[PDB]
Amino acid sequence: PRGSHMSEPNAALAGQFKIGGDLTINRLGFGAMRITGEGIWGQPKDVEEARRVLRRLKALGVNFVDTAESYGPEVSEQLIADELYPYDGFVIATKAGLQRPGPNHWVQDGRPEVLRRGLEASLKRLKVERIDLWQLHRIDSKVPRDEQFAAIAGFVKDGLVRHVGLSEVTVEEIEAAQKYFPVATIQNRYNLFDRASEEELEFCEANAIGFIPWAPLASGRVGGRPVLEAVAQRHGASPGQIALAWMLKRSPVILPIPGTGKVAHLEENVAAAGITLSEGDMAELE
Ligand SMILES: NC(=O)c1ccc[n+]([C@@H]2O[C@H](COP(=O)([O-])OP(=O)(O)OC[C@H]3O[C@@H](n4cnc5c(N)ncnc54)[C@H](OP(=O)(O)O)[C@@H]3O)[C@@H](O)[C@H]2O)c1
Numbered sequence: 001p002r003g004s005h006m007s008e009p010n011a012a013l014a015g016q017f018k019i020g021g022d023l024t025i026n027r028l029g030f031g032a033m034r035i036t037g038e039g040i041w042g043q044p045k046d047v048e049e050a051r052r053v054l055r056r057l058k059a060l061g062v063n064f065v066d067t068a069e070s071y072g073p074e075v076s077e078q079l080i081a082d083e084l085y086p087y088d089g090f091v092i093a094t095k096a097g098l099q100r101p102g103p104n105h106w107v108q109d110g111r112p113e114v115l116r117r118g119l120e121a122s123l124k125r126l127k128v129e130r131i132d133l134w135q136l137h138r139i140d141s142k143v144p145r146d147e148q149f150a151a152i153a154g155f156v157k158d159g160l161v162r163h164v165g166l167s168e169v170t171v172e173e174i175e176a177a178q179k180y181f182p183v184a185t186i187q188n189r190y191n192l193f194d195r196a197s198e199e200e201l202e203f204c205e206a207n208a209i210g211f212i213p214w215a216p217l218a219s220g221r222v223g224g225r226p227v228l229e230a231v232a233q234r235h236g237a238s239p240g241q242i243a244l245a246w247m248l249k250r251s252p253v254i255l256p257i258p259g260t261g262k263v264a265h266l267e268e269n270v271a272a273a274g275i276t277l278s279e280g281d282m283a284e285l286e
Pocket of ligand 1 (some may be wrong): 034261
């Protein structure tokens with residue numbers, strides 16, 4: 001990309017969102033799933049480049065990092081601890097609820113004792129007393145919902161979790177969770193090409209809940225679409241940057257976490273916060 005947003009990217013240009021009304025982030029965050037090996041498994045191939053991605057965040061204004069016990073597993077949290085501890089000026093969000101038998105292989109396990117073991121492992125790896133934003137990675141359909149929600153309420157009471165998020169949930173599931181704890185954020189798949197969670201987004205906006213879109217660059221597959229390309233060309237931008245600028249303008253509660261393991265791509269992603277789309281642009285994209 002050649003546009004002026006490339007010159008000094010700054011995630012604070014996306015605005016500040018106060019998670020739960022008290023924990024401030026710049027909305028354009030960083031997804032830390034990709035600083036792992038193929039299959040979200042083990043160390044990344046170029047570990048030193050992954051370390052440089054983390055080191056680059058502060059100067060680009062990125063202060064919101066999303067990871068998970070299951071990213072690696074362990075590897076993503078460990079690299080975050082290596083490079084970002086003691087996290088001055090950072091909010092690290094993490095998750096438990098998925099097990100990892102191998103590359104590309106995921107298993108839901110929401111048993112309360114397993115959720116607690118995952119949370120305790122994250123605390124120890126990240127070297128903190130309390131997780132700022134802890135997310136139920138999935139509601140495990142094999143375990144009664146209320147037992148998982150009750151375990152998480154215990155995490156909050158025990159002071160181990162500050163704010164609670166959900167992931168890939170419906171409005172009905174949010175309202176059920178709300179009987180046990182405030183839902184500070186949800187993290188649902190959402191991007192310009194996949195708006196199945198539109199109703200949940202509107203619910204989050206109506207209730208001041210942060211909406212974290214995962215796969216905000218549709219897993220990097222932003223190519224081949226003439227209208228997106230035309231909006232990008234007009235801004236001296238890439239299609240991926242317009243995809244991010246689109247969701248930033250779509251709703252004031254959206255908190256994109258584009259994932260990358262390369263410094264050049266991190267810079268391009270943060271630079272999307274400096275783009276100003278018109279309402280002509282939004283009309284064309286939708
Ligand atoms: N809660 C859930 O169920 C869930 C599920 C999936 C993801 N997530 C979280 O959401 C975050 C983002 O989602 P995602 O990583 O799966 O997909 P994504 O951010 O939409 O796209 C990531 C892909 O795009 C590439 N990429 C990123 N920036 C690029 C750029 N400027 N130019 C070219 N390629 C670029 C990346 O490869 P390179 O490394 O080569 O740049 C990567 O392969 C994840 O990291 C994770 O934190 C959550």
